[PDB]
Design a protein around this nucleic acid. Sequence first.
DNA 1: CATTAGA
DNA 2: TCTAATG
Length: 327
Amino acid sequence: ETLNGGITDMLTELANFEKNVSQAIHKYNAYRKAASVIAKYPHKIKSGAEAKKLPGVGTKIAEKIDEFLATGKLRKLEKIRQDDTSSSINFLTRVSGIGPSAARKFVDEGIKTLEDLRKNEDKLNHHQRIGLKYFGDFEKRIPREEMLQMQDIVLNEVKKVDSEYIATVCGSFRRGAESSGDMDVLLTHPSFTSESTKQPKLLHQVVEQLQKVHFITDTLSKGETKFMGVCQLPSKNDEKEYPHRRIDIRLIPKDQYYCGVLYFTGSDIFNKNMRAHALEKGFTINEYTIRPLGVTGVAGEPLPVDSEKDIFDYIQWKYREPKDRSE
DNA sequence: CATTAGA
DNA sequence: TCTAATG
Ligand code: NA
Ligand code: NA
């Protein structure tokens, strides 16, 4: 956690570069597991060889360790750290939509700068373009202040279109969080569940409303169960506009809301934790259900869930408010 | 790990 | 279809 620090840091430093800059998913896979284990290891590693003793630690890695150990630096790393190519990739990859592969491509053709990326929107796709457009606005955290207002509006239409529609801004915001990255609204409906073959219209209706009122300025991807787009709070009695924000809304079959809802709220650890626990209490949890655990090693039969509460009660737990879902 | 775009 | 990019 701190003792095995730099090591893991350099490991993942190394890993990240393999998976993007190169297409070295193995090597990339290498660095990763290794840095995972040296990560749990309780003693101050003091020689590659030492570390070596580990599973995942091969020759190459250890060798680096030794180097990193000796000198507080890495060659491959400082050389890597300097290459404007790998650099350009690291950067380019930022744009929502620009992934490594697109990244390289862009680089080879020579788009290194954001400006470059401009003169050639032509070669960019819709996503990317928007992603390029709000390059600045997308990098920004959302003041809890705007969330409310954003949320307020969401909730107002969902309701305005169909009274039956249950909306639920999850995530960090919902966890109390002061700022968040983007807005994620969980959507469901009664007329919609596990069997009852779709009703695409469901998501579609509200997407339309959010557009009608001008909350939603642009679409990333609309699909029959998950909409990905771009929203904006009305720029008030002017002198001030709102930055564009990323919003996502997904339609959930009523029978599995809460499960998603729990999950979607997080934290990451909180889940695993509750999850790791559901297991001891003879259960199983995941993005949609909670199924009793059978001794024959496995079992199923997805248990009816009324709210986040029933989930706890099942696993026999203490209702922990969203604020306290920190872990 | 599953949904969408795109080509 | 397969591949990418988002989450
Ligand atoms: Na070994
Ligand atoms: Na991106």
